[PDB]
């Protein structure tokens, strides 16, 4: 993942569709269920490298169900500091009634899962194999 296209708009610190980058801070994470970072992007354009400063930078999060389509759903942190989600999980991205997808900014986006345990799980969606990291109780 590149920080060149990563929106940093921190102040005083269901369909996904498209989200303006002026109201997001930190990386935008989406789950295929494997974690994927989406960089700041022009409206149907090349990925821009402005740290989410420019007012035309958005996050193209257009979604279809994941076996042969885009990530399940995306999660991120917005400017005020609230966890904003979209789409459907595999609230947070749940692959199991007691298991979340582990990613670098999981603790920042969901601090309630700090005492969770990390396991190496396998999830089969469609016909493709995904070896991801899971945080469970």
């Amino acid at each position, epitope marked *: 993942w590149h920080i060149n296209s990563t929106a940093l708009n921190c102040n005083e610190s269901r369909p996904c569709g498209i989200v303006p980058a002026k109201s997001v801070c930190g990386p935008v994470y989406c789950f295929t269920p494997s974690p*994927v970072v989406v960089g700041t992007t022009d409206r149907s354009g090349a*990925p821009t490298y402005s740290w989410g400063a420019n007012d035309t930078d958005v996050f193209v999060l*257009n979604n279809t169900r994941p076996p*042969l389509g885009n990530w399940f759903g995306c999660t991120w942190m917005n400017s005020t500091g609230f966890t904003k989600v979209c789409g459907a999980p595999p609230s947070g991205p749940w692959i199991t009634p007691r298991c979340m997808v582990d990613y670098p900014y999981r603790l920042w986006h969901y601090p309630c899962t700090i005492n969770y345990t990390i396991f190496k799980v396998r999830m089969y969606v469609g*016909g493709v194999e995904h070896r991801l990291e899971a945080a469970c109780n």
Partner: antibody
Amino acid sequence: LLEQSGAELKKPGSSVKVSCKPSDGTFRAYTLSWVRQAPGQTLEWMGRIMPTVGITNYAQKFQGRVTISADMSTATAYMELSSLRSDDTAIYYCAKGPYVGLGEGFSEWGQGTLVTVSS
Amino acid sequence: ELVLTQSPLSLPVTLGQPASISCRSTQSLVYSDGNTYLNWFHQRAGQPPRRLIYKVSNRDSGVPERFSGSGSGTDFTLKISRVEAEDVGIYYCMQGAHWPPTFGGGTKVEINR
């Protein structure tokens, strides 16, 4: 319109790289797939790459033997097909699928690259 | 797990007459998000395929009105109202409802002048 690499002859066991360049010169929001057609066979989908985000997905047949890489600031997508075999000679197309994902098919196709394998 | 049968494989029809190509799958193509993803493609000799029908009933731009698709679930049909000399080559049905997306067997259309 989509540009594509020229025809190539690669001896068995070597690798081949096919390029796919958009006419605009800048990547956009679409999924780029690679579909080949063997002589006397139906169209066979090989792999898909989302160049805006960098997600790759290959078919189970070519797993571990094909790799699709896209370079930014160059407007080119490459398909590294290693460990070639006499049955792998075909016409390789690069097709533009919607960023939404495959399913609706491909709007634009490549001109077709004929890769021949022979000693 | 899943396969598509394209019938008939060779459909010779006279000029200016209807012609239908059936495409049958084994599973339902309704998918999760409720949109049936089946596509039809036209390929000429020496040219790459171009899309004519991006959804079972949706017509793509730059395509004459003489084309239309039908069906739901497993059975599908690509019907041509008036066959012209332009409509020659191989026709494929592509399904994007179950991984991996495979193409049809191919239907070569021949004129009977």
